[PDB]
Structure 1
């Protein structure tokens, strides 16, 4: 049941902004590890005396990495005279954000038809304002509201290249890395209480609940066409194994973004490329499910995947689950930084062709059962 209750025209995921201690080093690590190209910069060399911001792109996926310079560099400036290309930036907020959470996502950015109206409607509908709409060079408008914890949902809209004040990067500094990742599929938040979080965000967006088929309860909010997907988790206390959501909240000092799901146009090549680089600067992956998990795969998705594609799944450690609508291939990295907080998920969806509809195959919740009922190989 899709009631199509968006309160403003929401287009697509536009970018994800990390707040870092040092943007250069995180961005270069992510570039190698994920296969993303250096696309745009705003820093000292572009006149920005306030922050360093570097953009990586892969297909439609945009990762923005931002860190503050010394406040002294911009001591004479005021907000009207700022050289920051992202006027919502604030040294005190960024240092407090990073000191409090460590490396993680500050902004989940979505493109809307009119950022000023989306901000006005949102706040009128319960959104906590974070940064009011600002018009960059008569061309781009950006506005921010609180999402959960210190994460903001950022609205961007264009009259008609990333943002004004960013420069395209000279191509000799821009090596065309690509491991197949093409767009952001969904972005997941962890909160201490799901209900009030759901009520708040659904409240000011009009996003509807997306239908689903140990440790947490979750739910998914979605825009009209279900291209913007925002799952949210809460912990379930009192279990046998401690909730990883609870571990997240402890180490992150509260609510925040748990993981980013990146859609690959060929998940097998992406995982081959990423695994080759795990131990030489890239990302590590969670431990692989046992071979019994893969001995049981022929029976539920042998429909969709050949024996060859199934055996390739076992090599790369890929997990597979299925909706009534499509099939989902997924895998999870280990945490991206020091803290056991943010990680990345690689995914590819098969089915639901109309273009492909969002959430096709769901989010893998069928894999808790498939996984637990596979650790019965410890008796095999």
Structure 2
């Protein structure tokens, strides 16, 4: 690493396969009904598809939530040839729940062809997880190891909006379901003990290029830190941050806390983009009291005087005041404005959480990664988590 300021952005467009978009993210669950049901109301992502006993699948229970291009898959084992996801392992899924509580199993990329992505990845050092399979109807599926037991899943299928999530999934449209304006996955972040081997491995087999980086001096506190690199596809629409702890500090790094509590590497957080995040957050906050998500404590009021100074030329007073009311973090550069906020942990352990983001700018379609990653927001997020961890420590 050289640090955020010294990193010269480039884009060689070195992808080894066509990484078109995030397709979905799959959580392996103790109970898919419980997780999907909670997430549906908490995020405004209505049930869109199911594959389970009611669809003839006795191998696994899968529920798909959608908010526009946000697609969350919740899969749990029952107590085989009927599986709609042939990579599914009941034993592994059962162990996963015990090992982590709620957490991400698979990060799915839509690719031109699953077999080609798999072949190109494995020829450039990817560890195979699931050999390519024809799912029928022109669908391809393959998986390789991403970090720890999280897999990178390749999905290919013909263009067409009649297309099922996957063959064997049955559509759902609930009378009176609503969304809260979530549009797409923005980024998916992994925590690992050692960054350099994982970054080399993933960039190696994907051809994904460095989009950004952050050292402890960029985003850490007096007491703790991390190092981060973000890998990106050619269009910089698929963004995969990677964090490692830094050791020898006054406190333990929140990334090491994660590894300790999670029981190994995994997805720390998933960022969900909205075209009006302030509106989205108003809806999500209304559901907080009745089992929805909560948000990390906002910065003090003086922060929001800074937001005026730094971003008052792009954001209206109405938006800035709403940012303050909702506890949103604001960062800007010459291309974009970043609005970001983090939930409290979404399961039992202080591990996995979610992020709501809006990128303002770079209108052309919007250019991928508009506004990049904000050093200012990053350092506030990090401080936020550190403070959260201290509160937990204060009650021992």
**Shorter-chain TM band:** over 0.9
Distance, in Å, in 1 between the alignment partners of 2:140 and 2:295 is 38
**Residue 353 of structure 2 aligns with which residue?**
343
Change in Cα spacing, 1:67 to 1:145, as seen in structure 2 (3 Å) is same
- Describe the SS at the equivalent of 2:377: helix
Structure 1 gap ranges (5+): 71-76, 375-380
Contact persistence 1:192–1:255 (CA under 8 A): yes
Give 1:252's match in structure 2, choosing from 262, 272, 291. Answer: 262
**Residue 262 of structure 1 aligns with which residue?**
272
Contact persistence 2:28–2:103 (CA under 8 A): yes
Report the alpha carbon displacement of residue 159 of structure 1 after superposing the two structures with TM: 3.2
Between stretches 233-242 and 106-115, larger displacement belongs to: 233-242
Change in Cα spacing, 1:206 to 1:308, as seen in structure 2 (3 Å) is same
Report the alpha carbon displacement of residue 366 of structure 1 after superposing the two structures with TM: 1.7
Task: State the Cα deviation string for residues 69-121 of structure 1 (Å, max 9, x = none).
Answer: 01xxxxxx5xxxx1110000001111122211221010000100010011011
Contact persistence 1:38–1:175 (CA under 8 A): no
Between stretches 154-163 and 102-111, larger displacement belongs to: 154-163
- Describe the SS at the equivalent of 1:288: coil
Q: TM-score, normalised by structure 1?
A: 0.92
Counterpart check, 1:61 vs 2:70? yes
**Aligned residue runs from structure 1 range 3-42, under 5 A:** 3-42=12-51
Change in Cα spacing, 1:345 to 1:371, as seen in structure 2 (3 Å) is closer
Distance, in Å, in 1 between the alignment partners of 2:201 and 2:213 is 21
Report the alpha carbon displacement of residue 368 of structure 1 after superposing the two structures with TM: 5.2
Counterpart check, 1:313 vs 2:316? no
Report the alpha carbon displacement of residue 370 of structure 1 after superposing the two structures with TM: 6.4
Contact persistence 1:5–1:206 (CA under 8 A): yes
RMSD between superposed Cα atoms in Å: 1.7
Contact persistence 1:190–1:258 (CA under 8 A): yes
* Corresponding residue pairs, total: 362
- Describe the SS at the equivalent of 2:212: coil
Contact persistence 2:340–2:377 (CA under 8 A): no
Change in Cα spacing, 1:175 to 1:87, as seen in structure 2 (3 Å) is farther
Report the alpha carbon displacement of residue 372 of structure 1 after superposing the two structures with TM: 9.6
Structure 2 gap ranges (5+): 1-9, 215-219, 385-396
**Aligned residue runs from structure 1 range 113-128, under 5 A:** 113-128=112-127
Distance, in Å, in 2 between the alignment partners of 1:342 and 1:18 is 11
Change in Cα spacing, 1:220 to 1:368, as seen in structure 2 (3 Å) is closer
